[PDB]
Every structure is written in C-alpha cells, then in structure tokens.
Amino acid sequence: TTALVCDNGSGLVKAGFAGDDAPRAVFPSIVGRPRHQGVMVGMGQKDSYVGDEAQSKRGILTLKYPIEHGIITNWDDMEKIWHHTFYNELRVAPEEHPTLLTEAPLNPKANREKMTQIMFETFNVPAMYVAIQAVLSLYASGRTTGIVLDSGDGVTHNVPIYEGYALPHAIMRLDLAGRDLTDYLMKILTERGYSFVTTAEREIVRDIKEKLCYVALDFENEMATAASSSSLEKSYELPDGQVITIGNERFRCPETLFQPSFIGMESAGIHETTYNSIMKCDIDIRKDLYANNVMSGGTTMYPGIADRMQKEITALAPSTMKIKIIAPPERKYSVWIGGSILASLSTFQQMWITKQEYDEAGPSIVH
Amino acid sequence: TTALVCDNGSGLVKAGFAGDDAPRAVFPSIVGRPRHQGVMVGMGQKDSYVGDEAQSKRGILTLKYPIEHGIITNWDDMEKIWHHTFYNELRVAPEEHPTLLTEAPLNPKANREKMTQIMFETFNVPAMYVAIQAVLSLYASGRTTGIVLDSGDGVTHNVPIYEGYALPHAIMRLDLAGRDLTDYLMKILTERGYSFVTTAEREIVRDIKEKLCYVALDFENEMATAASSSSLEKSYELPDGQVITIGNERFRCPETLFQPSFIGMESAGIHETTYNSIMKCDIDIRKDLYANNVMSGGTTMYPGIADRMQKEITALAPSTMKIKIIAPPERKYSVWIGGSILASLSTFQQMWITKQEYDEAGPSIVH
Amino acid sequence: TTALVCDNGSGLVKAGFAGDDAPRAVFPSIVGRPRHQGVMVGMGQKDSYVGDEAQSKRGILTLKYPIEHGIITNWDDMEKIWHHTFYNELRVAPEEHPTLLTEAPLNPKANREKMTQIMFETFNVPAMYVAIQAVLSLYASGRTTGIVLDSGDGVTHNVPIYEGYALPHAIMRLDLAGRDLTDYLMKILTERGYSFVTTAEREIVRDIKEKLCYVALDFENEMATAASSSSLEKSYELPDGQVITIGNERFRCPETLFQPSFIGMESAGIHETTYNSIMKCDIDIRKDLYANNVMSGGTTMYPGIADRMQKEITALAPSTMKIKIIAPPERKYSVWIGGSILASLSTFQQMWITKQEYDEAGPSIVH
C-alpha cells in the first residue's frame, strides 16, 4: 500500500513512509568488520555490524562509510544498508511499497542507472522515482523561487530554481564540506595535544563537530578575542574519562565554509558560489533570487550562521537590494519533508518508473 | 565416554571430569627422591614418592616442583605427575576420555607443542584441546568483557577480553608471584630468628603463607600500627613443637604485589600493570574495562584484597569513572569451573584436535 | 662565533657545529636513576648518569628515554640532556653560538613554544631557529621536489614538498615505528624462550634490532622458506654468555612497516600512506612526486628495503609511471647534513629568532 520516502543520505540515511511529520528512522550509515581476533568464542557474533549497533560497538570494528565524496563506493555494502533498513528497522516488504529515492545533481553517470537497476532487480519494488535532493528542499520550503543549499557530510550543492523552472547552466557543486571538516577538526585538535588517530575515535571528533562548534560573526575580531584571556574555551567530556578543552579551533573549523584556503581547497567559498551562481542567471530573475536564498541539510545547523552568511553575501551583492536568507527550523529533516509532499500529490505519481516500463527499457532511458 | 578437565597448575594441579561443582582431585604436584641412606631394608619403598604421600613423608625426601617459572622443567617428572594422577587418583583409562589441558598466554614455543606431542604419543588420548588459563576464567566469571588476573605460584598473567574478542597487544606477564613470595617470606622470617633453610621446611613457610598472612589497607599506616605495642603478632604452631610469633612481616610479604621493589624486581606492580594494560586498549573499550576487572587463582585469596586493589586502582585511574573489582567466591577452582563450561558446550568440541588430524599434522599446526 | 646544529633526536640526539661531514657527537639520550641500594659507600656516584656512561652502567640504573611518542616527557630530564651535551661533550659555551634546533611537523602546540622559551631563558643562546626534521632532509638530499620519510624510534613522518613550496593538507604522521618495533621484537623473542623482561635488557633487544634484523622481498615466500630446514637462523651472542638463535621473527619484526595489523595498529602501512599522500596532492604535481620518494632516518636502514618498498609502491601505483625510490648513503646523519647546509647559507640567517625579538615577543609569535 503506502509509498516510502527513503533519502540516500551522505551522512545519515533517512527513512519514513509517506507523511507526515519527520523520518521514522535516521542512522549514521556505517558498516564495520571486526578488527580484533576472536578468542572469546561464544560466539554469536555477526559477520559485519551495521549501525546503530556499530556505533555502540566502536573499537572492536573498523567503521567504513559506504558513500564517499558523494559516490557509492561499493554496492555490496550499500545493499546491506538497504536490506538492514527495510527488514530490521522499518519492517516492511519491498513488494508492498512504491519507493522514492534521492541523488545529487552533479554526480557521475551511470551511478543513478546502476543504483536504479540494482534496486529493481535485487529488491523488486513495484515502482520507483529518483529525485535530486535540492528540488525536494523547495517543496519543503514552500517557496516557488530561490537558490537551494543541500550541504551534508561530504557533498554540498547549490541549485537555482525560479517559478517554476530550473536554469541548467547555473548549478554549482562544492566538495568543501563536511567529512573534510571532520578531518580538519581532527588535524587542528592535534594543535592542543588531542590526538585521535584511530577510525573509531574519528566518530568522537564528529560528535564534537555537532555539539561544541560555532561560527564567528567577524573572523578577525573573533581571532582577536581568542587571543584574550576570556573563556572561549569549552570543556568536553570523553567516554574514557578525559576532559578536553578546546578554544580557538572551535570557531576556526566551521569558518572554512567562508575560506576554503584553510583546508587547502582551491575553489571559492559559499560566499562567492552564491554570488557567482546568481550572476550566471538572467538579469530579470536575479531580483527574486535575492531574498530567496534557502539553506538546507545538517551541516547548515552550526550556531553562527545564517547571520554570518547574510552579512557576507550582503557585502558582495550590489547596493540597495533586499537580501533575506531563509533558513527553516529542523533543516536536518528538510529533504524528507520534501519527499513526503511530492509522493502524496497527484499527478506526477504517474511519472514514476513502473515495473512494466523497467521490463521494456531497463537502465536505459532513466532520464 | 565423558571428557576430562585437567588443569596444568603452577601449584596445585587440578583434575575432574566434565561438570559440575568442583575438581575431584587437587594436589601439590611434588615429586621427591629419597635423600637419606636406606638401612632399614624392609624394604617396600618407592623409587620416587609423588604427592599427596610426598607431603606426609617430608624430610626423608627432597621435594622438586616440576613446573618452574611457568615452564615444565623436565617432562620425565611431568609424565609421572600425569601417570600418577590418571591411574592412582582419578582411576580412568586415557583411551576412554577426550581431554582438556591448560597453558599460560605468554609462555615460550615449542613448550605447548612438545607437551601436546608427548601426551598424544605417551597416553594416546582420543582427542585434546589446550586452552590458556585466563580465557577459561571468563567462562567461569560469566561476564563477556574484562581484564583477567590468573595469579598462581609462580606465574601471574593479565589478559584483556572485550565482547567477544581479545586484544593481542595488551597481554602483560608478571613473574612477581607466588614462589618468590614463598622465598621472600622465608627471607623475612629470618628477621625474627626463624630460619627454615631446608627444602622440606619450605613447605611449612608456604603453609604460613596460606593461613597467617594478610594485606594492608594502607601500607604507611599499617607500618605505623606495627610500631605500636598492639597485637599484630599471631602465634603459629609448628609440627615439631615450636611456637612461632610473627608480626610486621605477616602483612609485609603480600604487599610485594603492590611494590615489586621489596623483592627486588624491576617491573611495575599489579596497580600499574592493570592501568597500563587498560591504557593500551582502545578509547571506546576502556569504559567497560573499568568495572570489569576480574581476579582469579589461589594467590588472589589473601584477606586484604580486593579493597586494597580497589583503592589503589581508583587512585591512579581518571576521575569520575566507575570501578568495581570482581572477585568470585572460591577463586582457587575458577579455571576448572571454566573448563567444565567449555567442554560441555556445543559446537567448539569439533574444534578439538582429534587423532586423525594428529596423524596428519603432528606437532605442526597446533595453533 | 660559529653556529651549532643540534638535532633533537627521538633516539639518538645528534650534535655538531656548522659543517661539514657528520655530527661530532651522537648518543642514545638515556637518563638513569640508581635502582639498587648504595652500600658500597665510596662513594663517588652521580645523582643520575646520562649516556654514554648510562649504557656502560646498565642494570645498576633504570633507563628512561626523555622523549616518548615524539613529545618531550619532562623538561627536567631534557634540560639535563642539553646541559650534559653542551658542557661535557661538545665543550662549548651557549653565549658563544647561535643554535639550530629540530622538531616534528605534526606535534602538539605549545611544545615548541615551551621548548624555545626554556632554552632561551635557561641557556641564554644569542639566536635560535627551529626547523621541522623533514625539510632539512630535502636540503641533505639535494632534490627540489619529493615526499620525505623521517622515521626514528618512535615517530615517523611523511612530508610532500614540490619546487619550492609545501602542500599543507598532505602531511601524514604514523606512530608505527620504532620503539614499538623494539617492544614487538621483545614480545616475539619470547616465542623462542628468550625473555627479556627488564628495562636494561630492552637495550639488548634494540641492539639485535640493529644488527640481526632484515626485511623480506615477498612476505608469503619468506614465510615459506622459514618453514624449510634451511638456515634462516642466526646466532647472536649476549654479554652474559648466552647464545641466542632467532629465525622467522628476524624478518617478521620489520615487516610490520608494511602491515601494522601485526602490532595491532589500525592505521595503514607505509605502502598506503605513501600512495594516499601522493593522491591527496594536485594532479599535475603527482608526475614528479613519483620518482622523488626520499627516505631518511635510522629506522630506514634495515637490509631488505628499499626494493621491498619499491615493489610494493609500484604495485599499487597507476600503470606506466616511472617510480624510483631515493635512499641516500648514511641516512642516520641525513637530517644533520641538512642542518649544516641551512645555517651556512645566506640569507635566512636573518630569519632566525634573535634575543631582541625574544625580549619583545617571548613565546608568542614563534610561528
């Protein structure tokens, strides 16, 4: 009966049936093989633990994310993510639900084909559709115009949409955030003697990326007050007992979003990719792209944005033009709240790929 | 029919069929040749007396323990231990029982090979398995995680196990206790004029190590109250008639377990080997190694432990972490209660070495 | 007058004035307190012996290396290393020489500050500079491009440099070798019954790490010929009289450099850190990083490298690309031969920290 909205997270895969409030299942997408000798012999141990149990059994496994730089690294682990989610989380049969899957707008072909093809032949869903994650965040936002920011660990994208069409030549992909923000945080916590070399401990770094980080209002003046003796230093507690005190680096790591030079990436910041995508759109349409800048995803939830993002864009943009930055409550579930609206509406249900069409055309003509 | 659990004591060899309550036979493992001229001529005297009769015929023999510093000194005496136990104690035929043998985790190779090989070719058992003594104490404990302490006269070991695998690089071997505690007790009883120079009399020292010793709560303050006129002095009775009054040295000898400098050993105490083995294990796993410290063996049965061990570890360990020291009732039979659980369970019975495999591979591939 | 190049060894501190051939003084960096009771009463004994005399007075002391995991453990012993070297080895006055000190590229802050600050305030040098050990090995190598390997007991590093700039986001630190290779050698010599438990005896293990070890060409086939009766076994002689015969473990211990799983470290081998640091550098620059792989330090002097290192990298690297592994004669003095070239050249002498600047800025602005 009911359609299923399953979002192919970069993080953080999100799953829930059509409507209403939020995804029913969210989990960190990890598969982990056992890296220690089995001498206990109980045995009772699984061949590979998936999440969430692989986030409660850290250090006895070696966590490997299955999606890396926005591409699925191997479909052997990906299929196990899917199977684990459908059977032992959601508890639904594939033959009972038409599904809805997500992708990234600037991702290589035939990665959507191979995906679509494997999911139809392995799980035998009765119908399917694959949406780019940015378009769904417009439905979630409830605006009919604007530039969409889907930023997750680790693929960001910048898609401009105007009432009610998209401009093909204006889409910008930054590989700037967020797994590289995790790795950069791990490199600048070494500056205060906190060395987290192992795979498992890298998750702890990610947890400090959630809770303790913030973004500055003005870099130079936050760097100034960091030099002062005042308490920028916040004390985190670690599962083994250690108390970790981080200062400067706490606001330094997210600031990378405005200066990619810090992480050593040549590309221009969110600051400039916003401006340069708007100034690749037609003159008349720019008037309503200003004041319809819509952020989304989990990596836009740091405290110091959006009024940093606002002040930076407003400084580079032409004088005497109104700029408002639209940032929804609960951006982490934005894409999913999109998907729910889509699959419930008539009539584009009948633009979904159905099994009869798949039998005829296979991976051809997916576009 | 029934499998036999036979524990290769360092002491104190322990033997009993599979299940249930306790080993059927325990004995001090001594062989003794006759050190006096035979002029009685009855004769009727055995070429060498084994225990228990060699502990009732002391002084007419020279007792020689067959396992010394955790290694079997010669298999000529060891084979006589085995033969004596199977035939004139247990009263079982070797061809009727699959056996279960024990070893130490950090013991030289090919001492397990040579053992396995001699026992298969001499006693012709139909199947065999050799377990390290620490792993069996986990089965006895009924916990799935924790650091294991097998301390017997005279090899201790410290093995960390986490659900349900072992960490290879964290095993610590101290040669600190217990035959050196016997020898140290013999050296500090000389301080009160009790000189026990002969081999036989050394057993009497060992008996005073059992009954009269205790461990302090705080060394410095027990040393203080020893200087006081109050009765720390306890009167032991000796088989010849002598009444021996020991004071300070009564709590001094076990304290060596926390300060190896007293016996002149360079290595760090149980205090520090516990901490340093935990801080060689992964950060996430340390959280559940704290509060799963499991003691075992006969030399952990002194009265003043475990709350000395507790207070000392709790002082060196990081602040705000829960530490409980798990010390079973009847630790002297712990290993054996382990072995019983192992050989009764399916399926690792079919990971035992069988005669057909021994015919094919011999001492090769025992690992 | 003349500047002094003093290399802050992890081993093995190296010292010599500016130019020409080799360091004038090399020594094992040990401080040792006396672990036995002083009953001889001559007396004439020093409070603590430093090396070299602490390597001729082993067993009466407890040797403690002052640098542990690449960090200075306490500056009380470090200052005594420095004082001993300058006064009773080199025989130079601190006020007479501008000095040159070394560090590690991925080492916590403020460990270079605290060092610089203590050495300026304690020894009152008229000028100072602190170089990372890898950059100096490029000057020694005489190449203008390439990835630098500084591997000493016990911090390795992997720094890529291209004509004539460095790439910040490509530096990799492995804590894989070499004190852990010493400890691993001590753990696998126990497999042949050679138990070297004490601190002093650990030096003897280190000496067998120098002389008798080798690296395999192909692991699986060297493991095969080890199973054969052919003489891989080499006989070492020990200062007490013992003749030690080691076989398999002789080539097993260095092989850890290609498989960190053996020592239980989660990180990827030199094999993969070489490849993964090159494939984090820009596409155009990789062409000349291939064939400019430059090794350095004392722990790269084992016999079986570099043609193992070559064959392993050449197998993982893309097809049809020339790979040469540059390994200098006398790699143990490489860093120092670097330092000599640096301090002799104009003009970056005037980028050294001078006393006037230290008076003004102190430990601030060392970077």
Residue numbers in the entry:
A (entry chain C), B (entry chain E), C (entry chain D): 5 to 371
In the authors' words:
Myosin motor proteins are responsible for movement and force generation across multiple scales of biology ranging from muscle contraction to cell migration to intracellular transport. In this study, we focus on the MD of myosin VI, an unconventional myosin motor unique in its ability to walk ‘backwards’ towards actin filament pointed ends. Here we present cryo-EM reconstructions of myosin VI bound to F-actin in the rigor state at 4.6 Å resolution and the ADP state at 5.5 Å resolution along with corresponding atomistic models.
As we expected actin conformational changes to be subtle, we obtained a reconstruction of F-actin alone at 5.5 Å (right), as well as a corresponding MDFF model to control for error in micrograph pixel size calibration and differences in processing procedures with previously reported structures. Despite this preservation of filament architecture, the actin protomer adopts a unique conformation in each of the three states, with local deformations occurring at the actomyosin interface mediated by the D loop and, intriguingly, at distal lateral contacts in the interior of the filament mediating the interaction between the two strands of the actin filament. Consistent with what has previously been reported for myosin IIC and IE, this flexible loop also shifts upon myosin VI binding, orienting slightly towards the MD. Both the ADP and rigor states exhibit excursions of the D-loop relative to the unbound state, with a Cα RMSD of 1.0 Å in both cases. The Cα RMSD between the ADP and rigor states is also of a similar magnitude (0.9 Å), demonstrating that the D-loop adopts distinct conformational states as the myosin force generation cycle proceeds. Unexpectedly, myosin VI engagement shifts the H-plug towards the two actins located on the opposite strand, with an increasing deviation of position from the unbound actin state as the motor proceeds from the ADP state (Cα RMSD 0.9 Å) to rigor (Cα RMSD 1.6 Å). As we observe the conformation of the H-plug becomes increasingly deformed as the motor proceeds from ADP to rigor, with increasing RMSD relative to the ground-state of unbound actin, we speculate that this segment is adopting an increasingly unfavorable conformation as the binding affinity of the actomyosin interface increases, suggesting strain energy may be stored in the filament as the force generation cycle proceeds.
